[PDB]
């Protein structure tokens, strides 16, 4: 046969240890580029002028960071949303000073991760599965787009994208609270309900199935040996689990249908995290959390503070201190 | 950077002692008659 046919058969082969596929043709080079640049930058990159004020911030291990403080630092505010590939710089020295690696990493990562999602659709199709695992993955993926692309677009600069590091993430969160009161935004609150609820139901489902494993083992060996990979019989008694759960709450509170149960397990965290991503992506255009500052007033007109006003005092402390040398005029308008 | 000198030995033992414990158990499992 001709070579295009053999190569195409290898690309779409369901026998490769790791599935390649057509989305994989894009995913593999972009994720490798992003991964290699990230590792080299995290170890060895020099300080980066994130806020465009000639005040370079050190992110890499060799320039004085540890695992917790290190980061790949976002590109310079002087660049804004301009496209800054390596060949736009006069030299690698300029590229590194201005935060070039950050743009290289996040653009390759976002492309590679979108292809990761298509690859999940692709293999499920090739295996004769139903298609929607990729829809579940769209929730974390949407969240990564929010903090690396959408929020920079709304604010006009990749210097406000989330840094690629542990302490840099916290910096992003604290500045975000100062500028958007994200805690008071219902989409973030839905996000919390999504991940608090996802963790709760994770523990719940795990505990209920484990509680009802059918006895297949002796007292010494692990009970996991009681399940053989690929056996036709279900390994636990769901009627027993729900006879417990229905008495724990009340009879009708239980998901007796395993398919409804497992659909709910998928839907609750995925929907909550969709709203979390949409929170970031809409605060990106400065539609912010609820503002009840001075909402309660006494009969004379004195302000009676609420807990919202205390939140505001903390937000003020964040606002006035962040990027302490970057603002020349009284309003932080992006 | 002026790091704590005991940080190195602390990290090294933290990795090695439990890793070796697991390696001992794994290898003697593999060598049992099959």
């Amino acid at each position: 046969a001709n070579l295009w046919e053999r190569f195409c058969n290898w690309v779409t082969s369901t026998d490769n240890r790791l599935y390649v596929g057509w989305f994989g043709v894009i995913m593999i080079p972009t994720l490798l580029a992003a991964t290699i640049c990230f590792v080299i930058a995290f170890i060895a990159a020099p300080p980066v002028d994130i806020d465009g004020i000639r005040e370079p911030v050190s992110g890499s291990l060799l320039y004085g960071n540890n695992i917790i403080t290190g980061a790949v630092v976002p590109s310079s505010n002087a660049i804004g949303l301009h496209f800054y590939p390596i060949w736009e710089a006069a030299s690698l020295d300029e590229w590194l000073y201005n935060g070039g690696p950050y743009q290289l990493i996040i653009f390759h990562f976002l492309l590679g991760a979108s292809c990761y999602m298509g690859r999940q659709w692709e293999l499920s199709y090739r295996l004769g599965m139903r298609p929607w695992i990729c829809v579940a993955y769209s929730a974390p993926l949407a969240s990564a787009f929010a903090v690396f692309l959408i929020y920079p677009i709304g604010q006009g600069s990749f210097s406000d994208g989330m840094p690629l590091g542990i302490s840099g993430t916290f910096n992003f969160m604290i500045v975000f609270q100062a500028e958007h009161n994200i805690l008071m935004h219902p989409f973030h609150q839905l996000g919390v309900a999504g991940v608090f609820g996802g963790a709760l139901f994770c523990a719940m489902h795990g505990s209920l199935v484990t509680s009802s494993l059918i006895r297949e083992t002796t007292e010494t060996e692990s009970a996991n040996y009681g399940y053989k990979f690929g056996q036709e019989e279900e390994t636990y008694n769901i009627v027993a689990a729900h006879g417990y759960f229905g008495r724990l709450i009340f009879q009708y509170a239980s998901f007796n249908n395993s398919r409804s149960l497992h659909f709910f397990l998928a839907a609750w965290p995925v929907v909550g995290v969709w709203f979390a991503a949409l929170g970031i992506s809409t605060m990106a255009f400065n539609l912010n959390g609820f503002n009840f500052n001075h909402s309660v007033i006494d009969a004379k007109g004195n302000v009676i503070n609420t807990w919202a006003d205390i939140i505001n005092r903390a937000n003020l402390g964040m606002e006035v201190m962040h990027e302490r040398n970057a603002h020349n005029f009284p309003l932080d308008l992006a | 950077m002026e790091v704590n000198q005991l940080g190195l030995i602390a990290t090294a033992l933290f990795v090695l002692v439990p890793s070796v414990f697991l390696i001992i158990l794994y290898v003697q499992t593999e060598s049992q008659q099959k």
């Binding site: 170890i43 540890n66 695992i67 990979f229 | 190195l8 990795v15």
Partner: peptide
């Protein structure tokens, strides 16, 4: 020495990924 420690642990983790994927105990139906 701290940079070497961080990079060493990271490198051990990537190696573990390689063995966990390609030298896994193979799933067998019964």
């Amino acid at each position: 020495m701290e940079t070497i420690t961080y990079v060493f642990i990271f490198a051990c983790i990537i190696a573990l990924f390689f063995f966990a994927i390609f030298f896994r105990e193979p799933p067998r139906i019964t």
